[PDB]
Design a binder for this molecule. Structure first.
Ligand SMILES: NC(=O)c1ccc[n+]([C@@H]2O[C@H](COP(=O)([O-])OP(=O)(O)OC[C@H]3O[C@@H](n4cnc5c(N)ncnc54)[C@H](O)[C@@H]3O)[C@@H](O)[C@H]2O)c1
Ligand SMILES: NC(=O)c1ccc[n+]([C@@H]2O[C@H](COP(=O)([O-])OP(=O)(O)OC[C@H]3O[C@@H](n4cnc5c(N)ncnc54)[C@H](O)[C@@H]3O)[C@@H](O)[C@H]2O)c1
Ligand SMILES: O=C(O)/C=C/c1c[nH]cn1
Ligand SMILES: O=C(O)/C=C/c1c[nH]cn1
Lengths: 554, 553
């Protein structure tokens, strides 16, 4: 192993290569970017986000991945198995250069206890979604999704804009840290409970949260003031959600929306029991992990009961993909699922058109490369004012972390248009170096997760996981530059299966042929999957886009 | 939509109905999987292994055939639990079909949830080769069953098994290979089977030799034949959960004990003690939970008899039908006191990438397989065990559907063979293309802690990254169709595994694909066993020049 190394890693910048080609330089740079101190939550331990989501299994494996990517030939493919470079095989230049499979366990053994047994033997690594597949871009990766969720909740419950309203939530980790800024962009104030001061500080440093209250009473004074003024200000409060949310219910405080984004998906590592310190928690997880898991899950039950109590008061309440309802249910809160997941409640119609967390990064390191792509997106999508406003807010309010990157939700049809245009900007020298195009594994065709993205599918097919497997096979066949299959991202061991893809735009004609089919097929599989489930909006999209769906179009 | 009173057989000869041999091949192998001489119950789409099906339902079957017929050379069909769900543009060196069957998010990966989805029209059990169109009747498993009995004989009895007998049960599609495998290894065998129609199928296909009239008759025949050193297989109509405890009580001592009933699926594949098959199938529809319970309670009695034979010193092993797990769930706490066949006997073969490599003649002509048998002997001139295998196959294995051959070979020889076969197609020595495939039971394509990855030396039994990487790499290298299945062999919850088939159509493009795919597919198994730290696998990797960064640098 070892899993601690006191080094600062950053992606190399500019146009000169360390690896043999841009197709192998790209995953090299994106692996290193996943560990950049401005990007990752705890990169000296290889941790990117999401509990113990890691970029490589241990530091020996990291070193060997870098060494191997550096020498990999253009007709060779590296296999990464739970963060370990296990084999290099001959393929061809239009296949992926890296195939990644992280954290997959045969289902009867797919649980944290067995994962932790394997980890102790040096046999495991949790990939999360984008940690082990090298496409994490800091809090920006999720911020548009969290904004779209808050906007749609506002449209359903409050007439759209959240001006004068406030969101109550918890968790200011890598992904959770997007919540305050997303709320602000949606027009709302927010109170964001976080148990570690260093995480509040990271969100302040990256300008994802605005201020820190001195205590709960002071936080409520600020929320009362800013909402009365119609300001949209995010407030962090250092504390424990499982103590504060029940206290807020006892006080009859009524937020306008309630959710949670603590790392409840991993009770041993990601969720602080009430009354404990993070330091006690980390230490006791090593001596008495069973007792720590039970204490964490008991506090999750208290926390979810508070969420249910807000909901009974008429407050819009939803689960944001961290499996907390499941944990509470296992601890006796039999009605934990009385509030819905964010996807069936708010986001699923976007997935039905293949819209999701499409993203790209400038391997050059140059901010202006992303600003030039933003301008190109506006030229190619001239009549979508919501999207133009998103890109304006991103430019004005999202500061880059590590390599400049952009989140921009778009769906089937436009993803390929954008990717081909970016490839041509690389060819012409408008862009100073190639760019990579990817996405979260949360996307319309790439995830099965019955307590998150596939909760409450109208046909009952929540648990069917053929679809992400087919998505990864098809990305490999079409020519993505690296393809990944992961288990347990988001919701934890046992609860999801999902796929990732990244494709490099290096300005070549060969890349253009791959891009045209890969960025059609990847969102196409999500429209297909939702059309199969019988969503009329997905069937309409399939017809509009000319998809060939034999059981539907013949 | 579930039942169709039709006989289906693969098209023969050289005329295509699809646009190329790469799309004609999956069309013919899908049909071959349903041939009445191949499949256990093809009018309900069932190929083998409980309810392992070739397509979800008959509408889906028809649409797969229609879609394969029109598929272009740069298009790929996606099959999702036996349903043709999308056609997408790829390129001519990608697979024409990508298949994912029966995959369920792990917390829901169980038969109860499968059956809920099935009742909604949302599910199909792919087994291993049922849903991925490379089943060749009982021949697909017979050499692995033979290699298991041979290695058990080497470990326990000095090799040959002449004078010895095996006790087992299950004469279904794959269990039907057990009698002939025992015979070829030199042993007599007693094979318990609950359905006379299954005994008849094995008799007609020459996989079992005789049927005893009752248990006493069976034992008189075993005593006589073993005393004479004959290797004869005996079927007995009955219930193993009744007969095995009776043999323990009688003090009968077989020389090996195993089982291959469909214990992996209590609702459909395992008859409770005292029930008729009709009663079981009727009640399965009326009271499924009570049927599951009764089946599992009988599996517990069955497994306790196996444990009781082992206590008497009888070599006893689990042959991958998950029966130990079912018995443990019913209270047999020491059900895993006897091992699975792979850690006990077969794993050293997997460490060299050796496994159930196979091919089929799309022409339909037996002589095409005889020509390939002769070519294998020429290419592998100094392996007399393999030559004897092919001689025994010729003599004793009858073809079922398209003529096909099982021939266990590993890393290095698979590619030599497939390139030679492709050259035979190109020269016209073979009268039509051949398909080359394998079971999903193979060194790099399955994670199954109660079967192929039981008791890995490093404790990595449940790691299922490996079959997913195998499928991704076969897709990258250009197999003709690639599959990812869940629950083959051992049932929902207990395995994940990959399949591949590649067509040898005589062309230079196929040759390029074949050379890397038939290197990489067994290469991933040698890699996986090398990663676990098996010195035999590390040696193989070095011999074969594999690039394993954490071992070779
Ligand atoms: N459905 C989705 O789309 C989706 C998307 C992204 C992330 N996720 C999930 O979101 C969750 C957060 O991800 P992340 O990257 O921010 O994780 P992280 O591990 O980086 O951060 C979790 C934060 O929760 C805080 N925390 C834990 N227990 C607390 C408690 N009791 N009170 C207050 N704070 C507490 C921790 O101090 C930490 O800062 C994870 O469960 C992740 O898997 C789900
Ligand atoms: N370990 C391996 O390498 C391996 C390989 C292949 C298949 N399998 C498993 O082998 C098993 C058999 O496969 P198959 O294709 O023969 O299945 P099948 O469903 O075609 O046949 C099962 C047979 O078991 C018989 N049977 C059921 N209960 C019985 C009982 N109590 N007494 C006697 N007979 C009984 C049935 O009548 C049937 O003929 C399945 O569990 C399959 O998944 C394991
Ligand atoms: O946007 C990202 O990079 C990460 C997201 C993710 C989704 N679910 C768990 N992690
Ligand atoms: O040899 C075959 O075609 C099928 C086999 C298989 C292995 N395990 C479950 N099915």
């Amino acid at each position: 192993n070892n899993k601690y190394r006191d080094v600062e890693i950053r992606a190399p910048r500019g146009n000169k290569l360390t690896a043999k080609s841009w197709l192998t330089e790209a995953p090299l740079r994106m692996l290193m970017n996943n560990l950049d101190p401005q990007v990752a939550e705890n990169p000296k331990e290889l941790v990117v986000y999401g509990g113990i989501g890691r970029a490589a299994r241990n530091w020996e494996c990291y070193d060997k991945i870098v060494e191997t990517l550096t020498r990999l030939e253009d007709d060779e493919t590296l296999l990464v198995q739970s963060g370990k470079p296990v084999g290099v095989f001959k393929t061809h230049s239009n296949a992926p250069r890296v195939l990644i499979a992280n954290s997959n366990l045969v289902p009867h053994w797919a649980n944290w206890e067995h994962f932790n047994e394997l980890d102790a033997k040096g046999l495991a690594m949790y990939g999360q979604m984008t940690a082990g597949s090298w496409i994490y871009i800091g809090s920006q990766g999720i911020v548009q999704g969290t904004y779209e969720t808050f906007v749609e909740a506002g449209r359903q419950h409050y007439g759209g804009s959240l001006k004068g309203k406030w969101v109550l939530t918890a968790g200011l980790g890598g992904m959770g840290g997007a919540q305050p800024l997303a709320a602000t962009l949606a027009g709302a104030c927010s109170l964001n409970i976080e148990s570690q001061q260093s995480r509040i500080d990271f969100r302040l440093e990256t300008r994802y949260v605005d201020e820190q209250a001195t205590d709960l009473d002071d936080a409520l004074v600020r929320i009362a003031k800013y909402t009365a003024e119609g300001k949209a200000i995010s407030i962090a409060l250092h504390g424990n959600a499982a103590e504060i949310l029940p206290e807020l219910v006892k006080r009859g405080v009524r937020p306008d929306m309630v959710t949670d984004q603590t790392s409840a998906h991993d009770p041993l590592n990601g969720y602080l029991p009430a009354g404990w310190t993070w330091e006690q928690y980390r230490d006791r997880a090593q001596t008495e992990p069973a007792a720590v898991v039970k204490a964490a899950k008991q506090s999750m039950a208290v926390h979810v009961q508070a969420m249910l109590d807000f909901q009974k008061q008429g407050v819009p309440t939803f689960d944001y993909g961290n499996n907390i309802r499941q944990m509470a249910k296992e601890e006796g809160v039999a009605d934990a699922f009385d509030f819905p997941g964010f996807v069936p409640a708010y986001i699923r119609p976007l997935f039905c058109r293949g819209v999701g967390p499409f993203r790209w990064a400038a391997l050059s390191g140059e901010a202006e490369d992303i600003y030039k792509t933003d301008a190109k997106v506006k030229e190619l999508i001239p009549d979508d004012a919501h999207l133009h406003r998103w890109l304006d807010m991103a430019r004005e309010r999202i500061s880059f972390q590590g390599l400049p990157a952009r989140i921009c939700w778009v769906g089937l049809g436009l993803r390929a248009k954008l990717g081909l245009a970016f490839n041509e900007m690389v060819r012409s020298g408008e862009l100073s170096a190639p760019v990579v195009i990817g996405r979260d594994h949360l996307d319309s065709g790439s995830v099965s997760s019955p307590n998150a993205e596939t909760e409450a599918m109208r046909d009952g097919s929540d648990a069917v996981s053929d679809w992400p497997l087919l998505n990864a096979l098809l990305n490999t066949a079409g020519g993505a530059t690296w393809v990944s299959l992961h288990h347990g991202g988001g919701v934890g061991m046992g609860f999801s299966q999902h796929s990732g893809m990244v494709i490099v735009c290096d300005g070549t004609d060969e890349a253009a042929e791959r891009i045209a089919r890969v960025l059609t097929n990847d969102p196409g599989t999500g429209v297909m999957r939702h059309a199969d489930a019988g969503y009329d909006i997905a069937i309409d999209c399939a017809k509009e886009q000319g998809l060939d769906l034999p059981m539907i179009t013949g």
